[PDB]
Tab-separated table of C-alpha atoms in Angstrom:
chain	number	residue	atom	x	y	z
A	36	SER	CA	63.035	0.753	-18.314
A	37	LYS	CA	60.557	0.025	-21.099
A	38	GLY	CA	59.171	3.321	-22.364
A	39	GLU	CA	61.804	5.319	-20.454
A	40	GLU	CA	63.527	6.518	-23.632
A	41	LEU	CA	60.430	8.515	-24.631
A	42	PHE	CA	61.044	10.670	-21.522
A	43	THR	CA	64.792	11.400	-21.663
A	44	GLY	CA	64.260	15.075	-22.504
A	45	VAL	CA	61.549	17.757	-22.507
A	46	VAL	CA	58.264	16.501	-23.980
A	47	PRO	CA	55.323	18.627	-25.213
A	48	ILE	CA	51.948	17.998	-23.533
A	49	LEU	CA	48.339	18.454	-24.596
A	50	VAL	CA	45.380	18.129	-22.211
A	51	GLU	CA	41.733	18.122	-23.293
A	52	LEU	CA	38.827	17.879	-20.849
A	53	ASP	CA	35.088	17.717	-21.581
A	54	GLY	CA	33.045	18.112	-18.409
A	55	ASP	CA	29.506	18.221	-17.040
A	56	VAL	CA	28.809	19.112	-13.392
A	57	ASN	CA	25.157	19.198	-12.285
A	58	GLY	CA	24.348	19.614	-15.984
A	59	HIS	CA	26.701	22.589	-16.437
A	60	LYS	CA	28.786	21.648	-19.488
A	61	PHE	CA	32.317	23.013	-19.875
A	62	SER	CA	35.574	22.370	-21.740
A	63	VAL	CA	39.219	22.907	-20.765
A	64	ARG	CA	42.327	22.809	-22.980
A	65	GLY	CA	45.909	22.801	-21.704
A	66	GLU	CA	49.350	22.930	-23.277
A	67	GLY	CA	52.923	22.977	-22.021
A	68	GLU	CA	55.790	20.621	-21.412
A	69	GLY	CA	57.040	17.949	-19.063
A	70	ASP	CA	60.529	16.952	-17.912
A	71	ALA	CA	60.604	13.554	-16.225
A	72	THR	CA	64.279	13.818	-15.272
A	73	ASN	CA	63.307	16.549	-12.800
A	74	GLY	CA	59.662	15.524	-12.355
A	75	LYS	CA	58.580	18.955	-13.568
A	76	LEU	CA	55.425	20.072	-15.427
A	77	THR	CA	54.755	23.543	-16.859
A	78	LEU	CA	51.246	24.043	-18.268
A	79	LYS	CA	48.600	26.651	-19.014
A	80	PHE	CA	44.919	25.687	-19.034
A	81	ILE	CA	42.080	27.674	-20.639
A	82	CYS	CA	38.353	27.214	-20.155
A	83	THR	CA	37.116	27.362	-23.743
A	84	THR	CA	33.400	27.670	-22.880
A	85	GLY	CA	33.354	30.809	-20.701
A	86	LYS	CA	33.860	30.810	-16.944
A	87	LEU	CA	34.797	27.551	-15.278
A	88	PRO	CA	31.740	26.413	-13.267
A	89	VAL	CA	33.903	24.747	-10.575
A	90	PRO	CA	37.085	26.005	-8.824
A	91	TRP	CA	40.313	25.471	-10.796
A	92	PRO	CA	41.964	23.745	-7.771
A	93	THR	CA	39.360	20.947	-7.856
A	94	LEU	CA	40.553	19.994	-11.371
A	95	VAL	CA	44.301	19.822	-10.667
A	96	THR	CA	44.513	16.076	-10.023
A	97	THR	CA	42.324	15.344	-13.070
A	98	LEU	CA	44.279	17.553	-15.495
A	100	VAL	CA	50.147	12.793	-16.330
A	101	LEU	CA	52.051	10.687	-13.802
A	102	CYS	CA	54.355	9.351	-16.520
A	103	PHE	CA	56.316	12.567	-15.842
A	104	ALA	CA	57.123	11.618	-12.242
A	105	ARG	CA	60.797	11.412	-11.314
A	106	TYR	CA	61.506	7.792	-10.422
A	107	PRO	CA	65.044	7.506	-8.945
A	108	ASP	CA	67.489	4.829	-10.112
A	109	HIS	CA	66.756	2.261	-7.400
A	110	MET	CA	63.038	2.423	-8.302
A	111	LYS	CA	63.116	2.325	-12.119
A	112	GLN	CA	61.557	-1.155	-12.121
A	113	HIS	CA	58.454	0.206	-10.366
A	114	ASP	CA	57.467	2.873	-12.958
A	115	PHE	CA	54.187	1.565	-14.366
A	116	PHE	CA	53.314	4.846	-16.046
A	117	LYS	CA	56.308	5.028	-18.389
A	118	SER	CA	56.377	1.273	-18.990
A	119	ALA	CA	52.936	1.527	-20.635
A	120	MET	CA	54.139	4.017	-23.266
A	121	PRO	CA	53.698	4.794	-26.124
A	122	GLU	CA	50.383	2.864	-26.253
A	123	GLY	CA	49.434	4.494	-22.945
A	124	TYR	CA	47.006	3.787	-20.123
A	125	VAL	CA	43.466	4.527	-18.994
A	126	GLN	CA	43.208	6.561	-15.760
A	127	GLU	CA	39.869	6.445	-13.923
A	128	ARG	CA	38.949	8.155	-10.671
A	129	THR	CA	36.082	8.729	-8.303
A	130	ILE	CA	36.550	11.926	-6.289
A	131	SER	CA	34.161	12.309	-3.357
A	132	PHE	CA	33.899	15.810	-1.848
A	133	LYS	CA	32.935	15.667	1.832
A	134	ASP	CA	29.372	16.930	2.438
A	135	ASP	CA	29.004	17.569	-1.301
A	136	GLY	CA	29.010	15.870	-4.709
A	137	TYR	CA	31.473	13.639	-6.519
A	138	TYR	CA	33.423	13.612	-9.789
A	139	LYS	CA	33.826	10.529	-11.972
A	140	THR	CA	36.656	10.806	-14.509
A	141	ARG	CA	37.921	8.623	-17.330
A	142	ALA	CA	41.070	9.574	-19.233
A	143	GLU	CA	43.444	8.172	-21.822
A	144	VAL	CA	47.101	9.150	-21.469
A	145	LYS	CA	49.230	8.247	-24.468
A	146	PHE	CA	51.709	9.526	-27.010
A	147	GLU	CA	50.277	11.028	-30.200
A	148	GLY	CA	53.483	11.463	-32.166
A	149	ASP	CA	55.863	13.664	-30.218
A	150	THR	CA	53.204	14.967	-27.798
A	151	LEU	CA	52.005	13.296	-24.591
A	152	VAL	CA	48.209	13.728	-24.600
A	153	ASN	CA	45.747	13.482	-21.677
A	154	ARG	CA	42.137	13.299	-22.946
A	155	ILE	CA	39.523	13.360	-20.168
A	156	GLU	CA	35.773	12.970	-19.734
A	157	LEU	CA	34.462	14.267	-16.395
A	158	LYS	CA	31.011	13.949	-14.838
A	159	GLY	CA	30.083	15.730	-11.616
A	160	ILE	CA	26.956	14.619	-9.721
A	161	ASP	CA	25.035	15.494	-6.515
A	162	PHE	CA	26.702	18.874	-5.885
A	163	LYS	CA	25.097	21.498	-3.657
A	164	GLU	CA	24.472	24.771	-5.481
A	165	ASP	CA	25.505	26.648	-2.314
A	166	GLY	CA	28.465	24.476	-1.297
A	167	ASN	CA	32.184	25.140	-1.560
A	168	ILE	CA	32.508	23.807	-5.111
A	169	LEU	CA	29.581	25.275	-7.044
A	170	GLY	CA	29.697	28.275	-4.675
A	171	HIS	CA	33.355	29.043	-5.557
A	172	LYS	CA	34.661	29.219	-1.991
A	173	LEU	CA	38.146	27.653	-2.371
A	174	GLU	CA	41.514	29.396	-2.135
A	175	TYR	CA	43.550	29.474	-5.361
A	176	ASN	CA	46.265	26.981	-4.385
A	177	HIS	CA	46.860	23.232	-4.001
A	178	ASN	CA	48.847	21.812	-1.145
A	179	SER	CA	51.366	18.999	-1.277
A	180	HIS	CA	50.211	15.385	-0.977
A	181	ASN	CA	51.633	11.846	-0.920
A	182	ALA	CA	49.817	9.139	-2.871
A	183	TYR	CA	50.527	5.475	-2.235
A	184	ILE	CA	50.672	3.349	-5.407
A	185	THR	CA	49.865	-0.366	-5.203
A	186	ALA	CA	49.808	-3.088	-7.832
A	187	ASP	CA	46.468	-4.267	-9.188
A	188	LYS	CA	47.825	-7.608	-10.376
A	189	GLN	CA	44.391	-8.844	-11.485
A	190	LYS	CA	44.117	-6.097	-14.135
A	191	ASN	CA	47.838	-5.715	-14.969
A	192	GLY	CA	47.590	-2.167	-13.605
A	193	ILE	CA	47.873	-0.088	-10.458
A	194	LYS	CA	45.547	1.612	-8.001
A	195	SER	CA	45.841	4.414	-5.464
A	196	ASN	CA	43.705	6.246	-2.970
A	197	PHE	CA	44.448	9.522	-1.210
A	198	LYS	CA	42.756	12.562	0.323
A	199	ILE	CA	43.251	16.103	-0.989
A	200	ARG	CA	42.715	18.932	1.498
A	201	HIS	CA	41.392	22.050	-0.268
A	202	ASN	CA	41.701	25.280	1.698
A	203	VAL	CA	38.362	27.094	2.088
A	204	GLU	CA	38.253	30.885	2.161
A	205	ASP	CA	36.729	30.909	5.678
A	206	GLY	CA	39.672	28.961	7.104
A	207	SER	CA	38.048	25.519	7.013
A	208	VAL	CA	39.175	22.601	4.818
A	209	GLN	CA	37.228	20.779	2.080
A	210	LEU	CA	38.244	17.126	1.782
A	211	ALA	CA	38.290	15.383	-1.609
A	212	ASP	CA	38.701	11.598	-1.358
A	213	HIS	CA	40.356	10.134	-4.471
A	214	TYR	CA	40.159	6.512	-5.600
A	215	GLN	CA	42.184	5.795	-8.737
A	216	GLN	CA	42.651	2.845	-11.118
A	217	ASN	CA	45.013	2.710	-14.112
A	218	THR	CA	44.994	0.015	-16.803
A	219	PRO	CA	47.373	-0.299	-19.784
A	220	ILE	CA	45.967	0.258	-23.260
A	221	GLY	CA	48.433	-2.176	-24.853
A	222	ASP	CA	49.410	-5.738	-23.981
A	223	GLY	CA	53.202	-5.610	-23.829
A	224	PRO	CA	55.364	-6.052	-20.731
A	225	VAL	CA	54.376	-3.432	-18.159
A	226	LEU	CA	56.036	-3.029	-14.770
A	227	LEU	CA	53.806	-3.900	-11.817
A	228	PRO	CA	55.321	-2.110	-8.812
A	229	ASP	CA	55.884	-2.899	-5.196
A	230	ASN	CA	54.133	-0.509	-2.799
A	231	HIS	CA	55.604	2.996	-2.987
A	232	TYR	CA	54.410	6.584	-3.034
A	233	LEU	CA	54.455	9.730	-5.153
A	234	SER	CA	55.079	13.138	-3.575
A	235	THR	CA	53.478	16.054	-5.414
A	236	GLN	CA	53.724	19.841	-5.176
A	237	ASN	CA	51.743	22.389	-7.213
A	238	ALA	CA	51.913	26.158	-7.665
A	239	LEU	CA	49.014	27.973	-9.350
A	240	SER	CA	49.246	31.358	-11.016
A	241	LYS	CA	47.693	33.695	-13.583
A	242	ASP	CA	48.980	35.051	-16.890
A	243	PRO	CA	48.421	38.844	-16.844
A	244	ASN	CA	48.030	39.010	-20.646
A	245	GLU	CA	45.436	36.213	-20.749
A	246	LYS	CA	41.816	37.347	-21.037
A	247	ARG	CA	40.119	33.955	-20.814
A	248	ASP	CA	39.431	32.140	-17.549
A	249	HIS	CA	42.596	30.114	-17.098
A	250	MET	CA	45.129	28.509	-14.752
A	251	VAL	CA	48.940	28.501	-15.054
A	252	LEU	CA	50.245	25.394	-13.293
A	253	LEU	CA	53.695	24.286	-12.156
A	254	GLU	CA	53.934	20.753	-10.731
A	255	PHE	CA	56.750	18.609	-9.281
A	256	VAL	CA	56.233	14.852	-8.767
A	257	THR	CA	58.846	12.479	-7.310
A	258	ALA	CA	58.694	8.801	-6.348
A	259	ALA	CA	59.948	7.308	-3.074
A	260	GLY	CA	59.314	4.655	-0.446
A	261	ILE	CA	61.495	1.783	-1.720
A	262	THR	CA	64.984	0.879	-0.519
């Protein structure tokens, strides 16, 4: 639909994150490419301030749903692409069970030929000996479904979902996500019927990279509408 023609091929991506968790300031920069026809993302993220003070897996959801594969019968429900190129604001609260929370605010928009995700993150109330600041999470990210609903009052969408992070002792750390997206422009956006996104992620390391970093492969596909 509207905005779909910006995503017909492979698109370069830039991600910039400025973060502060319990007063520990950090910065992350990512680059790679996205292919919405297959729902595929290929990115490499570097911490540009030293060692990341939180586990890389806790930043995956924060670090571009316009690259989701929406099948033909659902093309009228793709809010994310319909907002382009002006883009959208993506805001989340992420509550970690028995621990602190992240608040994130991002702008996702085209800057010329590159899709850019610029994020501010604040982390508050974390336990210095918990799973997050204590670095106790496995280096992976399991698959999740996220239900998308229309926020007709704000011409946007909303979503809430739980991420289950594997803990190195065999337990699970829950991260409860509430999300709200609002268009930056005022043109015709698509407000969808209820549906969901299915996401898979694989995390790896570049052997020739010396900085603290994360190589990320992601697949996102839409479903739930007949």
